[PDB]
Design goal:
part of a larger assembly, 5 chains, A mainly beta, B mainly beta, C mainly beta, A: mainly beta, two-stranded antiparallel sheet, two-stranded parallel sheet, C: mainly beta, 7-stranded mixed beta sheet, binds a molecule of 3 linked components (NAG-NAG-BMA), binds a molecule of 2 linked components (NAG-NAG), binds 2-acetamido-2-deoxy-beta-D-glucopyranose, Hemagglutinin (chain D), antiviral protein, influenza
């Protein structure tokens, strides 16, 4: 008989919606994510140096509260404060 | 039609080892071959295709090359998840033809086997047939052998051997060899024993219960 | 994505018709081709034939071309194989597979069926004989004990045993089926349970002889003569 | 009386207020909700950040396309010659590549994939990933972004500054995303057109 | 202290925003020009063939 060649492109049984400028909704094969909305749920060490007050504010640590005074002559990349910390030796403003 | 040859016909190696399985053809077929992974007792899964072009779902470690008649699969790093029967299939010509299938195992974790004779249950005594089986829990090389010596005679060879394939835990075997008698034939004797000859250790341990034990 | 469910009687009288069906889940049946593939245990496997999952235009392996008849359905998302004048040797495991649309191409058998065993019913079909096996002193390791459950006298194969309905899985080893001199099939699915639990719990081995539709949550207990 | 002098250095060091424990992992960006990968370009975990933390936005999800326009073609088969393949009508079932050729000859009906055009397709997509993935800015000492007390005027202005930034970035990101999506969809079908032309030419 | 800290923030805010903003402007026009040039090539191409 007579041959017919006929061109085309692949598709996927299951796709995902994507927001564009041409059309606010469209279906494409393979989507991804640009927004990480999830955490491990803890301050993790590598590669930066961490230090946790665990009961002392940075001012409290800079001044000297006998309890939780270990922070003396201690260096850090990022200091963190606990919302359970407080002055418990002498008040100050 | 077009016979598919698989080489080596058998192979093994340890963790983090590279192994190569070669496929041959009767007629040189131009890069039209497929490889398959078959977990024993499971549905065989596709491994590679078209002279080993890389495929998603198959991690990078699995690789191959195609050159007319010279076709090889390479496991780059041997994990325990990699024990199976690997098949090279040709689609160049019809009808399709398959690899022979190479039983590949891991040469690792040689272990001392645990010996487990099985008692005749009461239903078994009432059944009129006594099956006396013995289980070896963990031996890597299959060097372990089974024998049966009742007090009277040698009842080895009358056992129907059933050995489990290599496990996800260990590339080891577990063999239970079923010596079934009739109640009449089994009752005649007194002292019953499972003996285990592990060529890996060459130390037979005989496990006996006398008449009266129930 | 794409999953398949293989269905059919795992037993069939000699020189009779074989009727099997496999399911599709995800994708559209109209958009691919589908074939079947045969494998007796521990030997070479073989391509049976394929059909136009879109149109119905088909092919078969020359050996089984007259013997095997494959089919489809657009309606129910299903497809069948009809095999006539079966042999005793034809006893195998079967598969449904996804093939490429091209009549000649690569990447064949991209996806496979779960695998359904098909045994010719040489002997009369029968119920499993569930044989408990009590752990003894001579069947207990320092860290483990050997509880057993033999399914004997069962015809045909297979028989799949659940342990506590699959509550325990650690060191559960289903020993392969055995042809005894009885001409009857049998096996045990041995369970390794720690030696500390001996004489405490009365464990259950549960028989799933699917064609016979038998459930035997038979316990294993020590008895004295 | 000071009992001496505190030595002052100048560094990337800062403060942060949180109640998440200290752990062992490898990740740079560190938030009150915890350590996240700094891999993707945006997050919506918190305004407050530290290190190579991807820019904070207000959005829940801004999905980015990585493939061509999906045309599921689930219709009753028309038994048409070949598959009646079209740039418009889709082609379900072509795992190999992104573009393929379907032919209806005398011998039968068959398909073959291309590698040349599809490699150039994926290539340009992979770049677009990298130009938007792993790239980051490091921020070492912000001003506080939460206020337990209202001191007044000063506090009011950095609340303004904060909201200013987030709003601007949010809209800014929203456009970036949308512009690229269009670009990809354009590039994919344009390469389809380019392959189309190559054949016809 | 605090006041200065916030202007440093304001500064870095502006430069960062503008930097990215300019980066896009540049890239968008480059594309536009390349498009317009070859499109006019295509337009002349079509004129001949038509
Ligand atoms: C960091 O802050 C927390 C909260 O302020 C401190 O925890 C509390 O600290 C006191 C001692 O300073 C604990 O008293 C202890 O009680 C236990 C029984 O719960 C007793 O066995 C001990 O002999 C002692 O009297 C208090 O219970 C504890 N709160 C809890 C855990 O509920 C923590 O001590 C601070 N870290 C320091 C100063 O090292
Ligand atoms: C990670 O944790 C933070 C908290 O540090 C979450 O952000 C939001 O923070 C506020 C507290 O500042 C949450 O509580 C709310 O407070 C307001 C007053 O500021 C009050 O009107 C409400 O009744 C409520 O108690 C708030 O729930 C929280 N979430 C949101 C979405 O606003 C942050 O959401 C957490 N990130 C996650 C889950 O990824
Ligand atoms: C869809 O495209 C994505 C591209 O992101 C592929 O996803 C890969 O795997 C993870 C998780 O999805 C991503 O973080 C990576 O960016 C991707 N891998 C790399 C290094 O490129 C995914 O393979 C594609 N999916 C399919 C099956 O089409
Ligand atoms: C895709 O997945 C969604 C969610 O599971 C389902 O509702 C939809 O029917 C699926 N579509 C196809 C074509 O499988």
């Amino acid at each position: 008989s007579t041959a017919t060649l006929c061109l085309g492109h692949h598709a996927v049984p299951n796709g995902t919606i994507v927001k564009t400028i041409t059309n606010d909704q469209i279906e494409v094969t393979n989507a991804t994510e640009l927004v990480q909305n999830s955490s491990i749920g803890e301050i993790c060490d590598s590669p930066h140096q961490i230090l946790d007050g665990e009961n002392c504010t940075l001012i409290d640590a800079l001044l000297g509260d006998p309890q939780c005074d270990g922070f003396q002559n201690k260096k850090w990349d990022l200091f963190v404060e606990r919302s359970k910390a407080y002055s418990n030796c002498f008040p100050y403003d | 039609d077009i016979q598919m040859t698989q080489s080596p016909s058998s192979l093994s190696a340890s963790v983090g080892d590279t192994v190569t399985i070669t496929c041959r053809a009767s007629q040189s077929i131009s890069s039209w071959l497929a490889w398959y992974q078959q977990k024993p007792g499971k549905a065989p899964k596709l491994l590679i295709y078209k002279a080993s072009s890389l495929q998603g779902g198959v991690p990078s470690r699995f690789s191959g090359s195609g050159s007319g008649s010279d076709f090889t699969l390479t496991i780059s790093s041997l994990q325990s998840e990699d024990f199976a029967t690997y098949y090279c299939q040709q689609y160049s010509g019809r009808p399709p033809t398959f690899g022979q299938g190479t039983k590949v195992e891991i040469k690792r974790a040689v272990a001392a086997p645990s010996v487990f004779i099985f008692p005749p249950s009461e239903d078994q005594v009432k059944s009129g047939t006594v099956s006396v089986v013995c289980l070896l829990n963990n031996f890597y090389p299959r060097e372990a052998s089974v024998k049966w010596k009742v007090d009277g005679a040698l009842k080895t060879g009358n056992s129907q051997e059933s050995v489990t394939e290599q496990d996800s835990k260990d590339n080891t075997y577990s063999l239970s060899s079923t010596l079934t008698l009739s109640s009449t034939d089994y009752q005649s004797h007194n002292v019953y024993a499972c003996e285990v000859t592990h060529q890996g250790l060459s130390s037979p341990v005989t496990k006996s219960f006398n008449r009266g034990e129930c | 994505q794409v999953q398949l469910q293989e269905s059919g009687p795992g037993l069939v009288k000699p020189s009779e018709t074989l009727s099997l069906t496999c399911a599709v889940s995800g994708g559209t049946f109209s958009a691919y081709y589908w074939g079947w593939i045969r494998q007796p245990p521990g030997k070479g496997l073989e391509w049976i034939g394929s059909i136009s999952g879109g149109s119905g235009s088909t092919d078969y392996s020359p050996s089984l071309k007259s013997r095997a008849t494959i089919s489809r359905d657009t309606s129910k998302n299903q497809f069948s194989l009809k095999l006539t004048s079966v042999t005793a040797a034809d006893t195998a495991v079967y598969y449904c597979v996804r093939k490429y649309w091209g009549d000649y191409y690569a990447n064949w058998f991209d996806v496979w069926g779960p695998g359904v065993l098909v045994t010719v019913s040489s002997a009369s079909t029968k119920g499993p004989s569930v044989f408990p096996l009590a752990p003894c002193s001579r069947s207990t390791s320092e860290s483990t004990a050997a509880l057993g459950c033999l399914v004997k006298d069962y015809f045909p194969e297979p028989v799949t045993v659940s342990w506590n309905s699959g509550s325990l899985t650690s060191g559960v080893h289903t020993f392969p089926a055995v042809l005894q001199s009885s001409g009857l099939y049998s096996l045990s699915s041995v369970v390794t349970v720690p030696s500390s639990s001996l004489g405490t719990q009365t464990y259950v081995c549960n028989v799933n002889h699917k064609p016979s539709n038998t459930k035997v949550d038979k316990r294993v207990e020590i008895k004295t003569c | 009386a000071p009992r001496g002098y505190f030595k002052i250095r100048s560094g990337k060091s800062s403060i942060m207020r949180s109640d998440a424990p200290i752990g062992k992992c490898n990740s740079e960006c560190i938030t009150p909700n915890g350590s996240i990968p700094n891999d993707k370009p945006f997050q919506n975990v918190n305004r407050i950040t530290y290190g190579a933390c991807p820019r904070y936005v207000k959005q829940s999800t801004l999905k980015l396309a990585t493939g061509m326009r999906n045309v599921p073609e689930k219709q009753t088969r028309g038994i048409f010659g070949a598959i009646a393949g079209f740039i418009e009508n889709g082609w379900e079932g072509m795992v190999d590549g992104w573009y393929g050729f379907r032919h209806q000859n005398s011998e039968g009906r068959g398909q073959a994939a291309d590698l040349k055009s599809t490699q150039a397709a994926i290539d340009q997509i992979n770049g677009k990933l990298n130009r938007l993935i792993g790239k980051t800015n490091e921020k070492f000492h912000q001003i506080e972004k939460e206020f337990s007390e209202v001191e007044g005027r000063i506090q009011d202005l950095e609340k303004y500054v904060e909201d200013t930034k987030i709003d601007l970035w949010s809209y800014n990101a929203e456009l970036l995303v949308a512009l690229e999506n269009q670009h990809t969809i354009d590039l994919t079908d344009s390469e389809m057109n380019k392959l189309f032309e190559k054949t016809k030419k």
